[PDB]
Amino acid sequence: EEDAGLVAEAEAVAAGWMLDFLCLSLCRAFRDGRSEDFRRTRNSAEAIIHGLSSLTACQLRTIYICQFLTRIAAGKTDERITPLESALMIWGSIEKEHDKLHEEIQNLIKIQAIAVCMENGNFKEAEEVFERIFPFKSKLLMIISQKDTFHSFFQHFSYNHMMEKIKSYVNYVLSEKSSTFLMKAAAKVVESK
């Protein structure tokens, strides 16, 4: 007396709910700097996403936000590019508006993809990252070439500035999803206690 098709549909609705919940949790962990909680939530979101074979436009945006935050968190930490270069590719392909905040995050990631290699002492890789991404170019390459890690350009387009701008974007995702089914029902149980 069990309809396998309706059971599979109920599991797909639940996977959709779990996906929103885990995106919300990943967003808060990234915002709060809770690295281990972020790693755990990311592993759970990655597994839950395998239970989905067809995704709506909203669900695709959700998984790409998750993948983007994952590469940003791996920034310092089957692809022959660095995590920040992979975050840059996701960022430019997400179905989202290219507003002032989008360009700021984009430019901050482009410079930090070079600066994190210099911070780690791998200047040959910083030049390779620069070549994959890029008069301004000749000056930026001269700065990398001279190992001028703390140049005022790198102090303006800093890692802290990249993280703050990404965190302000995360706040918009967090507010948009804070009302999703699973977190909303969980908060009511906690508030009733």
Ligand X SMILES: c1ccc(-c2noc(C3CCC3)n2)nc1
Q: Which is nearer to ligand X, 42 or 151 (CB)?
A: 42
Q: According to CB under 8 A, which one of 44, 106, 122, 149 is a site residue for its own copies?
A: 44
Contact region for its own copies (CB under 8 A) — 10-18, 96-104, 114-122, 146-154? 10-18
The CB-side HSE value for 141 (13 A sphere, CA atoms) comes to 12
30 lines the binding site for ligand X (CB under 6 A): yes
Residue 33 Cβ vs ligand X, minimum distance, rounded to whole Å: 4
38 lines the binding site for ligand X (CB under 6 A): yes
Query: How far is the CA of 66 from the CAs of 15, 170, 177, 184, 193, in angstroms?
Result: 15, 11, 13, 20, 31
Residue 94 Cβ vs ligand X, minimum distance, rounded to whole Å: 13
Helix axes 123-133, 83-91, angle to 10 degrees: 20
Site string (141-170) toward ligand X, x via CB under 6 A: -------------------x--x-------
1 lines the binding site for its own copies (CB under 8 A): no
65 lines the binding site for ligand X (CB under 6 A): no
Residue 41 Cβ vs its own copies, minimum distance, rounded to whole Å: 7
d(CA 122, CA 135): 24
Helix axes 100-119, 83-91, angle to 10 degrees: 170
d(CA 19, CA 152): 41
Sign of the dihedral through C-alpha 113, 115, 121, 124 = positive
Site string (152-181) toward its own copies, x via CB under 8 A: -----------------------------x
Helices and strands: H and E segment counts in the chain: 10, 0
Instruction: Report DSSP letters for 102-163, one per residue.
Output: HHHHHHHHHHHHHHHHHHTT-HHHHHHHHHHH--HHHHHHHHHHTT-TT-HHHHHT-HHHHH
45-64 residues in contact with ligand X (CB under 6 A) are 45-46, 49, 63
Site of interaction with its own copies (CB under 8 A): 4, 6-7, 9-11, 13-14, 17-18, 21, 25, 28, 32, 40-41, 43-44, 46-48, 50-51, 181-183, 185-187, 189-191, 193
Residues in contact with ligand X by CB under 6 A are 30, 33, 35, 38, 42-43, 45-46, 49, 63, 66-67, 70, 73, 160, 163
